[PDB]
Amino acid sequence: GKGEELFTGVVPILVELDGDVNGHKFSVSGEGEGDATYGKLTLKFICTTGKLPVPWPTLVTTFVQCFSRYPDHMKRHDFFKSAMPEGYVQERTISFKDDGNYKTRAEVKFEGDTLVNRIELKGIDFKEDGNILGHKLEYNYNSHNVYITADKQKNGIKANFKIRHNIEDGSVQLADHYQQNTPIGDGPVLLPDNHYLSTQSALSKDPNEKRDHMVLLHFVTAAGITH
Ligand code: NA
């Protein structure tokens, strides 16, 4: 398909986010590259407004599922690439158990040769001494399953999944995710059978970077359909 072809090689990525969490206003800029052939991306994020007012891990899912590796037998289920280059709207509600929630709206599309993720994030009802505003989450990331289903009335998809954030005491902060994607343009899109994405992430720091930042290495493979 047209959109699939745009991902056969290494594609530069830009991420831009404006956020407001409990009245704390912030912005983040990210850059790196993806290669969907291997389900791989690498990104570095900088908080351009000073200190990030929430833990970096809480924003990983918000900061390009078009870089997932879809096995060849599953390529007919790849909504994300099929929407390109015009792209898709990705909306989420992220519910932090016993704490606040993020509501996000992003547009993912090409600008020239570059894959861009532009996001607005709103967080409400966080506790001042919860794990988010209290900065009690460890700087690391677990491996998850993202469950995808078609949304035929919107010519898009939905997804549901549970992110587990390690807390520095040994406990876990659950972040339930609900997601909806809808196409921006008027090209044909692929409406998938039920499947999931298997994710893994590693978070690091650039030892030469003094601004508040996060380096992400991420791999994602579509699964849950045999052969
Ligand atoms: Na633990």
Phi-psi region of 128 (alpha: psi -120 to 50; beta: other; left: phi over 0): alpha
Whether residue 56 contacts residue 154, with contact meaning beta carbons closer than 8 Å, is answered with: no
Centroid of ligand 1 to alpha carbon of 167 (angstroms): 7
Amino acid sitting at position 81: K
Residue 147 φ then ψ, to 5°: -90, 125
Determine the topology of domain 1-227 in CATH: Green Fluorescent Protein (2.40.155)
Structure tokens at 28: 């983040």
Centroid of ligand 1 to alpha carbon of 143 (angstroms): 14
Q: Count Cβ neighbours within 10 Å for each residue of 183-219 and write b for 16 or more, e otherwise.
A: beeeeebbbbeebbbbbebebeeeeeeeebbbbbebb
Which residues make Cβ contacts (< 8 Å) with residue 225, sequence separation at least 6? 73, 74, 77, 193, 195
Which residues make Cβ contacts (< 8 Å) with residue 209, sequence separation at least 6? 44, 46
Tell me how crowded residue 41 is: count the other CB atoms within 10 A of its CB: 23
Centroid of ligand 1 to alpha carbon of 170 (angstroms): 4
Preceding peptide of 85 cis, ω within 30°: yes
Domains of the chain, by residue range, sit at 1-227
Centroid of ligand 1 to alpha carbon of 137 (angstroms): 10
Structure tokens at 53: 């007012």
Q: How far is CA 182 from CA 11, 79, 110, 221, in A?
A: 22, 10, 16, 21
Cβ-based burial of 105 (10 A; exposed 0-12, middle 13-18, buried ≥19): middle
- Technique of determination: X-ray
Centroid of ligand 1 to alpha carbon of 121 (angstroms): 27
Q: How far is CA 49 from CA 25, 105, 171, 212, in A?
A: 8, 20, 30, 9
List the end-to-end C-alpha distance of the chain, in Å, as a whole number: 21
Q: How far apart are CA 84 and CA 64, in angstroms?
A: 12
Whether residue 94 contacts residue 63, with contact meaning beta carbons closer than 8 Å, is answered with: no
- Pairing state between β 172-183 and 114-124: unpaired
Structure tokens at 119: 């996001």
Long-range contacts of 138-141 (CB under 8 A, 24+ apart): 138/57, 138/165, 138/166, 138/167, 138/168, 139/55, 139/56, 139/57, 139/203, 140/57, 140/166, 140/203, 141/57, 141/60, 141/201, 141/202, 141/203
Q: How far apart are CA 102 and CA 108, in angstroms?
A: 18
Whether residue 163 contacts residue 83, with contact meaning beta carbons closer than 8 Å, is answered with: no
DSSP state of 215: E
Centroid of ligand 1 to alpha carbon of 169 (angstroms): 7
Whether residue 193 contacts residue 143, with contact meaning beta carbons closer than 8 Å, is answered with: no
